[PDB]
Write a protein that binds this ligand. Structure first.
Ligand SMILES: [Mg+2]
Ligand SMILES: [Mg+2]
Lengths: 275, 275
C-alpha cells in the first residue's frame, strides 16, 4: 500500500548528490549475509553503509565483509561480553577524520549501539537505540538513554552539522505506524518514547529528513514483525530515520525507504546529500 | 664517539622531503611516556610514528595518545593474551588506504609484532622481530620467522614500493655493533640471523637506507644495554632500520639515528622521503 517515490538525486538548487548513505537493521549480520544482503548493498552502492543488530563480535566478522568494493574503511562495535545481541557497524568509502564509539557515558556504552564518524563537512552517527522491552520493562532506562543521547548529540551538532541515522526504536507520530491505537502502550509508541523523539528534534535541533520531504505521506514504514506476515499486509512501523541538522536541509536531495529489499524484518533506508 | 650528520631534507634531484617517518623501540609505552617520550615526538613532528615494545594492551592505551597533534590515525597490535610483552603501534597524520596486522601466518601472528599500512605510493611495515633469546633458545624459531617474514614482504613489494621499519633484532655486519667478536654467539649477531638479514635485502629486494647513505661509517648504533651504562661508552648495536625498495632510492633524502633522544634503551631513527 506504499510505493516509495523515485530517487531525487539533486538538491533544491540543482546540485547533484555527492553522498549516498544507507542504513539498515540487518537482524543478524550472518543471517542477513546469507539472505544476499551484501548483494543488495552492492547494487545500491552507497558511499557509507551503517548497520544495526549485527549480533556479531568485532573479531568474528564474516570474510564476505573484506570483499566490499568501495566500502573498505570499516568500524564495528558490539557488546564487550556476550554475543548475539545488539552491535553496530559503519563502512565507508572514504576514511573519516575520526571515529568514536558510544555516547561518552559508561552505563550507556556497554551494548555496542553507537558509532561516530566525523568527515570534512559533517559528523555521522549511527545508533541502535535500546528498545523499551516487553511489558515496557526497560522503559525507565530508555528514558534515561534518551536524555543522555540528546545531550551528546547536542554537543556534536554545536561544532559540526550532524547526520544521525539508524534504528531509533520509536514511531514518532500516528502516521509513522499502521496501528497507533493498539500500540500506545507497547515499546516503540509510548507517549514517553514519542516525547523523547520530539525533544531530540527540537533540542539539538534536527529535522526528520523523510517527514520533511513527505509530511503528509502515510503507510511509509521500515519494520514489520515477521509474524502473521505483517510485511505483506504492510502492518509496519517507521523506526529507522535520517535526522539532519537544519543547516543541512539545503543539501538534502532525498530520503528513501527501500520497502522492497529483503533480508531482515527492517528494510534499508537511503539518504542523498549534495555536499 | 658518534655524531649523526645534519638532516639532508632534499632528494638527490633537489625534491624537498614530503614524508618523515620516525621509528622507536620504546621499551614500554607507559614507561617511555613517563620519560617524556611524547615530548620528543612532538618536537620531531613526524608524519608517521611507529613504535615497538609497547607492552600495552589495545584497550589500555594511555590517554596521552589521544592528544597527539597530527598523528590522529592510530593502529595498535599486542599479544592477544598476557600483556607487558611485545606490542607495536603505528600512528599516522594521514589515513592509510588500508591497515593489516601480522604476516599472514597464524603461528607468527600471535605476539603483536607487525602492522602494515598502505598509502598512495608505498606500503609501510613496522616490525618487532622475535629475538633469538638467552642461550639462543629461540634461534630455531627466529630462523623460521625470518623466512616467513621474507616471503610476506616479497609479496607486498611485488605490488607497491615497500618501506620496512622497526627493531629487526640483528646487527647486519661487524660495523653494526661495537663488539662483534664477543657477540658472534649471542642473540642479534649469530651467523644465522646475519644471513637471514642478507637474504631479506637480496630477495625482496630491499636497501638498508642508513648504510646505503653512510656505507663506511662506524659506531652508529640504536640500542645500548642499560647495564654498565653502555650508552655513555657507546657500546651499542644497530638493531633498528629503514629498509626501502630499490625503486624508492631516488626518493631517499636521509636516514637518521637520533643518538641523543632518551626514554628507552633504543634511540629513535628517522627517515625522510621525497614522494
Ligand atoms: Mg531483531
Ligand atoms: Mg626491552
Amino acid at each position: 500500500l506504499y510505493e516509495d517515490p523515485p530517487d531525487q538525486k539533486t538538491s533544491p538548487s540543482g546540485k547533484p548528490a555527492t553522498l549516498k548513505i544507507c542504513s539498515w537493521n540487518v537482524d543478524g549480520l550472518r543471517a542477513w549475509i546469507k539472505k544476499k544482503g551484501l548483494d543488495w548493498v552492492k547494487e545500491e552502492a552507497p558511499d557509507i553503509l551503517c548497520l544495526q543488530e549485527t549480533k556479531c563480535s568485532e573479531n568474528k566478522l564474516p570474510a564476505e565483509l573484506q570483499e566490499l568494493p568501495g566500502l573498505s574503511h570499516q568500524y564495528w562495535s558490539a557488546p564487550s561480553d556476550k554475543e548475539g545481541y545488539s552491535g553496530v557497524g559503519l563502512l565507508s568509502r572514504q576514511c573519516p577524520l575520526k571515529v568514536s564509539y558510544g555516547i561518552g557515558d559508561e552505563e550507556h556504552d556497554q551494548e555496542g549501539r553507537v558509532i561516530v564518524a566525523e568527515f570534512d563537512s559533517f559528523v555521522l552517527v549511527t545508533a541502535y537505540v535500546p528498545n523499551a522491552g516487553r511489558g515496557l520493562v526497560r522503559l525507565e532506562y530508555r528514558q534515561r538513554w534518551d536524555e543522555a543521547f540528546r545531550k551528546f548529540l547536542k554537543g556534536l551538532a554545536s561544532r559540526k552539522p550532524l547526520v544521525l541515522c539508524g534504528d531509533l526504536n520509536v514511531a514518532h507520530e500516528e502516521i509513522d505506524l499502521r496501528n497507533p491505537k493498539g500500540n500506545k502502550k507497547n515499546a516503540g509508541f509510548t507517549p514517553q518514547e514519542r516525547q523523547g523523539f520530539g525533544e531530540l528534534l527540537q533540542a539539538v535541533p534536527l529535522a526528520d529528513s523523510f517527514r520533511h520531504l513527505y509530511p503528509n505521506t502515510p503507510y511509509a514504514y521500515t519494520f514489520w514483525t515477521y509474524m502473521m506476515n505483517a510485511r505483506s499486509k504492510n502492518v509496519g512501523w517507521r523506526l529507522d530515520y535520517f535526522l539532519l541538522s537544519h543547516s543541512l536541509l539545503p543539501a538534502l536531495c532525498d530520503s528513501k525507504i527501500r520497502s522492497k529489499a529483503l533480508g531482515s524484518d527492517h528494510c534499508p533506508i537511503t539518504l542523498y546529500l549534495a555536499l
